[PDB]
Amino acid sequence: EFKSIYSLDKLYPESQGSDTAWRVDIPLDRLTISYCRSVNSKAEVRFHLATAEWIAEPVRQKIAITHKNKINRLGELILTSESSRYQFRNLADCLQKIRDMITEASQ
Amino acid sequence: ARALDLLRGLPRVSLANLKPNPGSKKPERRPRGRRRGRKCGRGHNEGHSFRRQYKPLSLNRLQYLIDLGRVDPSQPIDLTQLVNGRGVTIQPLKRDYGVQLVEEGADTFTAKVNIEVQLASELAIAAIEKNGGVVTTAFYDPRSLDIVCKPVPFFLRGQPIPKRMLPPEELVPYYTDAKNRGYLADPAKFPEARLELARKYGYILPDITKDELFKMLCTRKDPRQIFFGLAPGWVVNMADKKILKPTDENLLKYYTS
Amino acid sequence: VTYIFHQLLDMREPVFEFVRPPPYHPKQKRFPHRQPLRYLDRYRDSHEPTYGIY
Amino acid sequence: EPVLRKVELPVPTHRRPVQAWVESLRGFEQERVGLADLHPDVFATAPRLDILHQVAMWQK
Amino acid sequence: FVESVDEYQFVERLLPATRIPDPPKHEHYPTPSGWQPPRDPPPNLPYFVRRSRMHNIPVYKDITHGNRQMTVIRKVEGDIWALQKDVEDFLSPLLGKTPVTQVNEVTGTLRIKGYFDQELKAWLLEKGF
Ligand SMILES: [Mg+2]
Numbered sequence A: 001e002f003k004s005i006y007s008l009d010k011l012y013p014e015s016q017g018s019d020t021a022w023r024v025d026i027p028l029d030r031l032t033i034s035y036c037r038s039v040n041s042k043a044e045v046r047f048h049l050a051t052a053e054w055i056a057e058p059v060r061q062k063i064a065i066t067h068k069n070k071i072n073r074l075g076e077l078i079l080t081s082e083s084s085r086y087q088f089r090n091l092a093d094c095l096q097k098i099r100d101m102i103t104e105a106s107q
Numbered sequence B: 001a002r003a004l005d006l007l008r009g010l011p012r013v014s015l016a017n018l019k020p021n022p023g024s025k026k027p028e029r030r031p032r033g034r035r036r037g038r039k040c041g042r043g044h045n046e047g048h049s050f051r052r053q054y055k056p057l058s059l060n061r062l063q064y065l066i067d068l069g070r071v072d073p074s075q076p077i078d079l080t081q082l083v084n085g086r087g088v089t090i091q092p093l094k095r096d097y098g099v100q101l102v103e104e105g106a107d108t109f110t111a112k113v114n115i116e117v118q119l120a121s122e123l124a125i126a127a128i129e130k131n132g133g134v135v136t137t138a139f140y141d142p143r144s145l146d147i148v149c150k151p152v153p154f155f156l157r158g159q160p161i162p163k164r165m166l167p168p169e170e171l172v173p174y175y176t177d178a179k180n181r182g183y184l185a186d187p188a189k190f191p192e193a194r195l196e197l198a199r200k201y202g203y204i205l206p207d208i209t210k211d212e213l214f215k216m217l218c219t220r221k222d223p224r225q226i227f228f229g230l231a232p233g234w235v236v237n238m239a240d241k242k243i244l245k246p247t248d249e250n251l252l253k254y255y256t257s
Numbered sequence C: 001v002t003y004i005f006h007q008l009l010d011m012r013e014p015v016f017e018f019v020r021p022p023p024y025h026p027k028q029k030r031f032p033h034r035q036p037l038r039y040l041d042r043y044r045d046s047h048e049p050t051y052g053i054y
Numbered sequence D: 001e002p003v004l005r006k007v008e009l010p011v012p013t014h015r016r017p018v019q020a021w022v023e024s025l026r027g028f029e030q031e032r033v034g035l036a037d038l039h040p041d042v043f044a045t046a047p048r049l050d051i052l053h054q055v056a057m058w059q060k
Numbered sequence E: 001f002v003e004s005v006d007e008y009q010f011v012e013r014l015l016p017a018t019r020i021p022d023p024p025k026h027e028h029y030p031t032p033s034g035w036q037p038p039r040d041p042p043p044n045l046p047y048f049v050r051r052s053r054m055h056n057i058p059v060y061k062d063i064t065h066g067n068r069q070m071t072v073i074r075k076v077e078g079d080i081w082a083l084q085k086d087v088e089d090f091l092s093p094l095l096g097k098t099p100v101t102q103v104n105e106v107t108g109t110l111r112i113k114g115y116f117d118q119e120l121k122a123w124l125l126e127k128g129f
Helices: A057-066 A092-106 B002-008 B059-068 B079-084 B122-130 B142-149 B151-155 B172-176 B189-201 B249-255 C002-008 D049-059 E009-014 E080-095 E117-127
Strands: A032-034 A043-048 A076-081 B054-057 B098-101 B114-116 B134-136 B235-237 B242-244 D018-021 D035-038 E047-049 E059-064 E068-073 E076-078 E101-104 E109-113
Touching (some): A043 A092, A057 A092, A076 A092, B054 B059, B079 B142, B142 B151, E076 E080, E080 E101
Parallel strands (some): B054 B098
Antiparallel strands (some): A043 A076, D018 D035, E068 E109
């Protein structure tokens, strides 16, 4: 191959490995997500707050207290919002709304 | 199909029959006469030019070309691929920028690719990485992009291969940051960005190095090399199917910029 | 009440929502003008949607 | 003997083959020797005399 | 300075193409973006539809005269009046009024006043051929 004078072998002189391209909180198995155009839509995510092992007991109590309106009759906390419907903008401020609720219940 | 035999029911269609289609041209009225004419037609933006333009590539249409087979995923997805099958066209003129990804609706999109566009959304980066894509953003300078995009003619132009210059100062900080998943940034800073995006996308970032086309995915294009498979300064002898490359030391030095 | 619904009435007990009307949402134009970033995100839903296609 | 000159490009199934006799100028009284075909796009499209007059104008 | 070279495989992938071929097989139907192959064998309906050079269902809009929106299927073949009657019948529940449609018998086309486009593409798709 050919290497530039300003090539990445020098432009990123420290990192010569391939794996540093993409090498590496909210659980993926526990929650359930939903999106459906209802034009209009409403995109929601629900999870059993009683079965929430990812939340501390005082944090779970604070979630069950503050988001008691979000706690369903089946004890499932759900959250729905409104911007646009697909992969990256619609599911994960639903996830991040859950995460921010957890963070606010922490303190 | 009664058409051909119904035509066979006449004499030979000679030159005496080729009638203009009724409604071909409205009648050429000489502006006169008792009805049409008695008097005959008289009676008794400051920086719009310095604004950049980047062709927005509909990535749903990229999925179409993936499905329609215009651009196969077996090799890298470059501007060579982006133009070569006529899925979306570029215009070198009008002081343009180049190819940049679009931003709507990545539902039902199952393929593996390695996208190299000038710009894209963070949602587009997560869109590529959701099935595990590769996203890189260098520049494509005006003469450089024009040479790159329609590679057929410059392959027979006769001058030696130019090398792509770096982006201008305004475009420099764009490529300098890995948060754009670009080309001119730190190759280790990209990993924390991928993790943060996978958190922000709620995405399970697979270990793409374990995949079969990981080496195919390992191709991240060298700067100042428009041709993905060829050497800087080269000459495509398209008649003899040869590659004419220089060997002179100062020529190699000015070539190795 | 639920006990009478299940045993005596022999039917599933209904539950009512008491839901208010939703926002009208303002008119969508071509450009947001002087408004903040919230103008372009009104009339769909929500939180993780994305770009053209994977 | 026989000869069957089919079309090289695969004509679609939405029409049958477009066949006719195959001739030659060799026999002064011996024609109709062999028969072949062509795609519908070759000799069996729509009649479309208007296109032909367009061809006439672009010629003349 | 000069040196003859034989590595033109990189030249080969650089050669853009012209003659567009039929698509590679996506296993499920419809495609990821929802493209489709035409069904085989074609149906025994005297209305006959060909597809595009770039291989889609041949339906198009039509814009003129400021408010004039209409649509047309272009490459019709066969007894096109049957396709017109069918389009009116499908349109019959769609808007109630009788279909304002005209064929182009020499041009072998059908056109319906108004844009009923995506549903018409659906009707042709459900026809399969
Ligand atoms: Mg029109």
